């Protein structure tokens, strides 16, 4: 799977909000482009003069994520974050010249991402009460990954002493994205666990935080809630469900070729962090079938 790389695999079956620190600093921002940020401004102007209803929006930038020594007390993860925008994304990661910006970042800063917006995405492995994960079909008419399978999520917009509010907005945003797209009541959702961070190499290395969320509704109830919004209540064109039993071997299925990179990230991290048992009981052959 060359189009997805794991930046972080969380310990302990995934980290709760209270174990994560953020450092939001202008030291974590994109570097100005070698010939100047006028190249970004020019692409944006061209785009607005075709689609003048488009708007800019602020985004969090991922710089890096450092895990504590395993088994330690205290904060277990430090997220280093800066600020970027939708405009900066369109002029760097989405640019035809994105590979040239990665090579120049390696040369100038020893960092393939130094000249990339790299907005932080969020996504969920969302499990039902009857042990299915939730999948969404993307419209064939959008610009990014048309017609591909996704999981719930999005790209959160901003608003450890500003740090804790930023971690709160990241955990909040994955629940809000589930309520907005799947049409589930907030009180049917567990507090999220962070499983890890995956990078999309087809989008020049931009990263998504992948979470596990449990729903108290069955697959049939989740489907009713999604459909009862009507076609205007969701950006996706359909919903479907795969038994957690079968998610284990999803990379061997014909579905795998249809998953967008960030959804592949969520499923690899679900299988390594919530699946893959370590103890004698769940590891026994009748509960963990060989091959
Ligand atoms: C639905 C919320 N719109 C949104 O988040 N955008 C990203 C920021 N600006 C935009 O103009 C749109 C572009 C887009 O793809 O929306 C159709």
UniProtKB/Swiss-Prot annotation:
Where is region (Disordered) located?
A: 147-159
Which cofactors does it use? Mg(2+)
Sites where the protein binds Mg(2+): 177, 181
The alphabetized UniProt keywords are:
Hydrolase, Magnesium, Metal-binding
Variant or mutagenesis effect after changing residue 181 to A: Abolishes enzyme activity with UDP-galactose
| GO MF annotation list | GDP-mannose hydrolase activity; metal ion binding; UDP-sugar diphosphatase activity
Which protein are we looking at?
Uridine diphosphate glucose pyrophosphatase NUDT22
* Species of origin: Homo sapiens
- Lineage, top ranks: Eukaryota, Metazoa, Chordata, Craniata, Vertebrata
The gene coding this protein: NUDT22
